[PDB]
Design a protein around this ligand. Sequence first.
Ligand code: ALF
Ligand SMILES: [Mg+2]
Length: 774
Amino acid sequence: DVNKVHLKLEGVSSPEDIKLIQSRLESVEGVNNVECDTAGQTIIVAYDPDVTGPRLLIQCIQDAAQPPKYFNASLYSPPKQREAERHHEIRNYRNQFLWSCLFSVPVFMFSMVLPMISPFGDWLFYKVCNNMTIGMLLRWLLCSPVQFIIGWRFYVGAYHALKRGYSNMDVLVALGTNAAYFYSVYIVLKALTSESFEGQDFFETSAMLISFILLGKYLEVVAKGKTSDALSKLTELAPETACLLTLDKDGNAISETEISTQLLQRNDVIKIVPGEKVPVDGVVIKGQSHVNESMITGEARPIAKKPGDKVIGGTVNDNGCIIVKVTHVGSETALSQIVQLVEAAQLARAPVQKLADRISRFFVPTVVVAAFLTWLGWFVAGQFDIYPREWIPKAMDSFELALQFGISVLVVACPCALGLATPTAVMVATGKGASQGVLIKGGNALEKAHKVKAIIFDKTGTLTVGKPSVVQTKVFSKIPLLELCDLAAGAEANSEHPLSKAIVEYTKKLREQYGSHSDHIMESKDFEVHPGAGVSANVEGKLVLVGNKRLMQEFEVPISSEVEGHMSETEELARTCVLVAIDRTICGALSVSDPLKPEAGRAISYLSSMGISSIMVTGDNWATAKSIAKEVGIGTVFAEIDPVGKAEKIKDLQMKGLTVAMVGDGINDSPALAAADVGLAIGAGTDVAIEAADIVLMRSSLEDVITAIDLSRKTLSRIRLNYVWALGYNVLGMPVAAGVLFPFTGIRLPPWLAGACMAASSVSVVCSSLLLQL
Ligand code: ALF
Ligand SMILES: [Mg+2]
């Protein structure tokens, strides 16, 4: 923008408006260079970064606004060309497959079944000049558009494999189809020029092969995955617009405009309404407020902001107005950095080498060195006359018999349903797995998740629940435990703090313990709360003081061994988890803790059992991290980590060889979620976390990570199969094709009983869905 703002003109279709805009911009000095893209109805404005800005230039653009339209100008980007392109590619591959069918299914409805049945068999076998029957001409005409139009893909793929590669799937399809087709043409032309030469055409296999490979290509796209990721959600985290200030301070007087955030630049001033998305990162000038910063820490403690510190963009304040001088803009904001990190991570995810290419790398050489040896068989057996003369068919020479057997090897050896081995599972895991509670956003995720050997874990939200709860509780003030929490909640009426919610929830749990929620409370009379202190109120004529040492010594409540028994470890010091909660008098304490990890303990234990290690890269306090990791069983406890560092840890563990996996919930995890080989997002986390992962965990349960890994292992089993079941049918038809049986049984190649191995091959590729082991 500030370097090169792209101004795609809106409502402009005539070059005269573009020229007027160009003249107005040339009348303005400060622009380093204007790249005049007259063809395209856009103008490029190149100038120095970190100076002035769009505003005046955009106003100059607007000044030419005359009928019939208003002359807006801004870089336009494809809004949903991703989903449109996904749908169009799926539809295009489907259309190619169906078009291939609507000529191949003809060839196979013809000379596979209809010749067997009359009267159609009579018409097909009704002869034309010499022995060429009209069936052969019809099939030659019908299969030709397939092989020579629909199959340009295969020919160009083979020619691009050439020598730069060794042999891909395309060359294998090329050999199969072309050998069958040209041998069929040979057969037909010879039957035309001969008088007794019989022999069916192999036109069926050539056309029918194209259908299956296209089916594989179609299933490739469908099973590739949902429309990429949609980074955009990060950009939506920042507000699209804000309010300029220019108010009070000497010259700054009144100017409460509503300029969009993009046009806001360096050395600007903004207003920040109480409770709204902070436009960009900056340094506050005046005002006291707390900000729900979840872009670095990822935790929901309202952090203090006094005039002088730096506020991070894409954040939400609560306590009043905050007046900010604008720091780094554009590509230097925290959200910006997140965007580049996630884009780089996603754009560097190289696709896995399909084993079909690996198989075809060796298999294609094998077929050629097998057909040639088959030819180097029967042929040399003809020169020395080992095989009896009567074996040769009518009107054929020893060379032709060798060719019949040699070309037969090529046709049968083609594996047909090899493309339908990875995508033919349509990733059934994307399926049964969804029922289990795992939604795989692709197939690459499933492919890479089996080899996971290490897995990182966010604490807040992922390992721990995240919303504080009062769990490890005790007694205290000189009123009953039930009355303790009753008066506490009474004080918590006007209070709407996270710890207030936790106190209310613990109160509900004890009301369950103490029968039910008999009667109720009254409002926070004399809402006396002091800074830091806690929650104080005169509820029911009782001046309660739920809080810390300041509020205890406010009424002079002695500090004793329970302010030394309920934090630090988690329950070893000040009398709740890390904090307040003692009410009025002391006999014990509470524990406003993050509600542990219902099953994550056994989850981590099971993960360690299968050899997968475990890491905890959080962003919260070292002290909190210590206790949680100690209790669950995690090893290394790298904490106080920013999103960039979270990505760095993943990259480091990748460098040492292990294939790692990120499990996260927040926007913090996104750089690490994308960077990891297979990112797992908790379905109760931020929407952009769901966005950036490869696997999303709907049912919030860390045990679903175990389920995902198991479902990824059980789909590499049964993907090594369905390669075995794909190749094997052709491999154990190659000897039959070569004619090994022929000396010992006298049975030649059946045009049907060995050309329709793809029916056996494809149908043999079935995938089972019976999983989950907790
Ligand atoms: F939820 Al975290 F570091 F524990 F982002
Ligand atoms: Mg989290």
